[PDB]
Symmetry: C3
Subunit: 402 residues, 3 copies
Amino acid sequence: MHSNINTLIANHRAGHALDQAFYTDAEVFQTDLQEIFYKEWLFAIPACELDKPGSYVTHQVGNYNVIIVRGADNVIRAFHNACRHRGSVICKAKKGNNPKLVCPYHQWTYELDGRLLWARDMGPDFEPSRHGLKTVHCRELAGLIYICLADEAPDFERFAEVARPYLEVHDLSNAKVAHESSIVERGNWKLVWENNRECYHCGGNHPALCRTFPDDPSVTGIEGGETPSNLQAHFDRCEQAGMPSGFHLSGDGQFRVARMPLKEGAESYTMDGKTAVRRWLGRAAFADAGSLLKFHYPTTWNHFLSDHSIVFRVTPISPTETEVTTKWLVHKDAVEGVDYDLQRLTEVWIATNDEDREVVEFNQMGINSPAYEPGPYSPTQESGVLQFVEWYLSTLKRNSGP
Amino acid sequence: MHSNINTLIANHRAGHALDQAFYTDAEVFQTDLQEIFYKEWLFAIPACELDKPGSYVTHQVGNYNVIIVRGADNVIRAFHNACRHRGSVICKAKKGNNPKLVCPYHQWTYELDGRLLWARDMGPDFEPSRHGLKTVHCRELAGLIYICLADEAPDFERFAEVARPYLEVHDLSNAKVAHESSIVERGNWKLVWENNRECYHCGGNHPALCRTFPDDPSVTGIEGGETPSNLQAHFDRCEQAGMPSGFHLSGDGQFRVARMPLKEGAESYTMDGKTAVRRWLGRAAFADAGSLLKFHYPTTWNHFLSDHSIVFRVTPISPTETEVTTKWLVHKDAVEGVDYDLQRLTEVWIATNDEDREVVEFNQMGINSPAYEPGPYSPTQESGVLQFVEWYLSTLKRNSGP
Amino acid sequence: MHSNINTLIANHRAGHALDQAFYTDAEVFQTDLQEIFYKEWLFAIPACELDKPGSYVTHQVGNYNVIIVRGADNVIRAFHNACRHRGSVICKAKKGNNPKLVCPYHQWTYELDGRLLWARDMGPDFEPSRHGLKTVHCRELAGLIYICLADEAPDFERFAEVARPYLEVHDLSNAKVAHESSIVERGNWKLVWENNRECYHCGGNHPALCRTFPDDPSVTGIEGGETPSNLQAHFDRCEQAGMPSGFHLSGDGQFRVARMPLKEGAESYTMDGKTAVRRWLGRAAFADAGSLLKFHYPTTWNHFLSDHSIVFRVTPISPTETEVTTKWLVHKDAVEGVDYDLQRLTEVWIATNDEDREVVEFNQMGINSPAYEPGPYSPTQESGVLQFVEWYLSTLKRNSGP
Ligand code: FES
Ligand code: FES
Ligand code: FES
Ligand SMILES: [Cl-]
Ligand SMILES: [Cl-]
Ligand SMILES: [Cl-]
Ligand code: NI
Ligand code: NI
Ligand code: NI
Ligand code: NI
Ligand code: NI
Ligand code: NI
């Protein structure tokens, strides 16, 4: 199926959803890994997860597995989780703390910067300098760790310069992960995004979220117009109080920040609309700060509120499988059972994620039929989906080309 | 493996079973879907399952999923279970009742004839007339629903004209499904058929069925001879009493009807040989009416008795997986616990199906070996298998050709 | 991936581990089956498992399944487990006893030499002489059964002549299987071997085994040197007492025998180092006889002790899956609960196998990464791994070539 990616891209019907092969074909999926996930910057973890020198996590991206580890100098570095002897995984656990990286097979021992310090009985010609752990590009942006698997990484600095002032409001280096949830959705990674970038399905599918989150297309979507005055008043209210808020969509479509108002009265994504956490994460001047929306394709969407923040990570597994990992961030000194209640903090987005998963899964299932033919996106209700698809096709064409 | 279907077909050894690739190869399986299951008429359901206007079922055939739904005008129609917006499955459940077909993703709402009645905020250029549900051919034959996935369906009327008078004896529009059983057999769909079209394995494998069902090859098989006089006397007894019974095999081999006698004394497929249901389904003049045998390749075999009927449906899943769905039909006013007992009604064919599944599964497992070489079919004991294989190869060659 | 096996082999970096494709690629795995497992001699079972005329086992090798059966004349024969009618498996069970081989589908009945004795109603032209069970080459070597799936088997006699005198010490025709364990390791079959042919990982991974088994590289490995004097003294002690012991590695690298000393004091692979069984299997002159090490690629490694013996069998399942079957052999008259205790006899190698499985599985997982690059084998600690890889590449090149 599809001949080649060039022909598939050239056949796309403007304003419509993607040809079936984009969502089902095994070769297109490998192209998506090679041209997108193995070339672009990827959101990995909040930095607060690496709490001490020697702290690490491991992270699977396609066929890669990456160790992300905080050094004795407190700098976070990334490496391929693959011993230079016979290839074994070095860190078997998803998280831990170790003063060295020690391969469990034959004990080759690496410094937390990747250098091989000891390898037993390798004989007179062995060169430890040629057998250090292979490196992965790693950046820290206002308390969030990004990685890149390519030999040569694209620019990070345009993104960082735009996003840093919005993100600094939330003091994320002093957060902790109050809760993590990882779900596997039986849909193509692109269907997860298309679903995330519209609220056309909200009225019919999200009771708990719709108590606080407007299904206004100017909030979620990408509109060409002058800013609606309710949005602008919120931007000005927040900026007068020292919280960067104005809408910014990058020129190439990869990322967007905007601090959008919630529904009348609402402070946070909770059943009652009130803040979940009594000790707030960051410097929000008032409880009804709305939500700082941030996306950065292909891996992350996020909501940063007055009291807590929620960071999301998308990792493709197969043409019809995608992991979504959600983390709720609260102030590091906020105590469960005193300053917040775990169920109250998490229930809205746990329910919302499952609802999104359901619609994505039945969308994929219908797309599997040879009868599927892509229809048109709603110009007003799915402007964000059109924008995502344009980012994807344009990026695929550029990264594939010369 | 096999180069192409033309070469595989051209290499078939007359009178022998099929080359391994026919039963194992992934490309041959896709050819079977494309040339047979996606082109021919397929038995779906008894009409009695759609009990009211708005009633529907869904049905998977290969990668297709079909909604079969009874309209407000009582006409049963079929559609692809795929929304014209972004492709979602519309009906998630295997069965239900709805006055409209409403997509659960963004609520596009279709009439029970497939027309798009409402789609929210699709903008000034949207044409609802171009976004109706895609249709599937659908026919009702004496209370049985058949479908066809091809753009242009083959003739149905020769089949219907032959079969209708035999089928009308059983008054199937006034039946109900007393019981349904669906099993996945770990064999190629062709092995399920080859097994169904012989009773060479009966003596060794079916104790409960052999109490009532003769393993005479003139009953199950396809013999060139003049009709054995015990069979002819039954045909005449039944026809004198107004029940069409005489043997008919279609010219192209696709279908066969004949009302065959059961063993001495037996009325029905029960452990004691007596009718299972006190209130009979249809107009049988006497209890020992034998069984109306009907096959129609590639999807259905059936047994219609004096008291009840059993209809079977074969749907391929993978090269080594096949679903067999069995439904026991009784008169709609027959009450479980009064007019019949569920265990008594169903036990013989539940056991027989499991026995068939076992032999099919160990046949497939042996065929998987590179040592497998097709042997000869018994000319007398497997005349029906030879006939099935000839239908399959001839149909594959015709549908593939110009 | 890899273009073809010739190019992959030609690109191997001397002294290093194999390119990723050798351990992951589906086509290379099929080449390994076709060129190695379907051409060479394979260890199947100890003969003592077939205790009586009519006794059989079945054995899966890739897509083949083999019946190994003891005849009424006490000769063990092998056949393809595939009926000559429609291909069914004949023997569904892993083991049993039958005076004839009777197909369960339609009862074709074969003699224990494979000849078709009866097939019902096959008509006047049927030739039973042309429908006997297809044969598999089968040899018995001092109580151990080997098979070969090729039309023409390679020489067995050089192997047999070398190994017989070492093996006869252990009187294996008078053993019984005290215990069997089969585990599926989530690694390529070559990783199982590479792991087996070194003790570089021993210090870090095998507490129970290291109580008795030296991690000396001259014991496990393949060294060019003059024999270390502790090894030679053991060879001479054992040979003076009539037990063949001296090191022999075949010219082509396929097999090796040597009776190696265990650690100070140790008699057997037990937690306390003492013999597990009071009634010894074979003629060992003293309890501290060391272990007769035997490998024969691609299927078997073994340890034969004074008191009991352990025989191991490697069967590939998929590119990343390998079955390891371990059998503990004791004297046929040794009684569990009197002459030995099952836990004491088996615990060391059950634990050791699981430990090996763990390291093999995490080695495979790391190798799956596109970042994997083969490193160098330890010249002194992994001489046996270098030797195995050389046997594999040389055999693959010879069997593939003209
Ligand atoms: S594979 Fe890591 S030390 Fe050997
Ligand atoms: S996919 Fe059906 S309404 Fe959107
Ligand atoms: S398949 Fe063995 S007797 Fe028919
Ligand atoms: Cl969102
Ligand atoms: Cl039948
Ligand atoms: Cl060993
Ligand atoms: Ni949603
Ligand atoms: Ni259109
Ligand atoms: Ni049967
Ligand atoms: Ni023949
Ligand atoms: Ni080991
Ligand atoms: Ni090197």
